[PDB]
């Protein structure tokens, strides 16, 4: 199924077992059938700033893409700029220049473990996305917050608020990093 999908991975310092985010990425990708005629994948990591791990038209094989994604290291970040990452992915990753296919449904999968420093310009960033008809799946990892005995009330609401409607369908509330590889089935099917 022809689909352009961009992963917006929060690379702040709290998502601890980094290989666990990667294990998840691997787990979600190994299921897809990538190809210029069905499913395209791109990855952007963020935290303080944004970097494109790889464009939507960079790879053609589900396997090659697998090797590429497993070599992504934690960029690191004190600040978590989700508004900046999402806006950049909508502004950059999704361009014919970076691989985006003309009239192919655009989907975003954002993964994060904390409230955004860029909290405020979310409403504008999201509404723009919804205007550019971009289905969004937001996964909130409550690990660091639960380990630190902090409320996640507002954190879950802000992440819920990024997911395309219906929120109960695209938003994923994950307990911790390890429990990520148990959300691959529902995300991988609700997507395609």
Curated annotation (Swiss-Prot):
Localization per record: Membrane
Domain VWFA: from-to ranges: 7-192
Glycosylation sites per record: 49, 149, 173
Self-association and partners: Heterodimer of an alpha and a beta subunit. Alpha-1 associates with beta-1. Interacts with RAB21. Interacts (via cytoplasmic domain) with PTPN2; activates PTPN2 phosphatase activity towards EGFR and negatively regulates EGF signaling.
Domain description: The integrin I-domain (insert) is a VWFA domain. Integrins with I-domains do not undergo protease cleavage.
Family recorded in the similarity comment: Belongs to the integrin alpha chain family.
Free-text function comment from the UniProt entry: Integrin alpha-1/beta-1 is a receptor for laminin and collagen. It recognizes the proline-hydroxylated sequence G-F-P-G-E-R in collagen. Involved in anchorage-dependent, negative regulation of EGF-stimulated cell growth.
Name used for this protein in its record: Integrin alpha-1
Organism, scientific name: Rattus norvegicus (Rat)
Included stretch of the parent chain: 169 to 360 of 1180
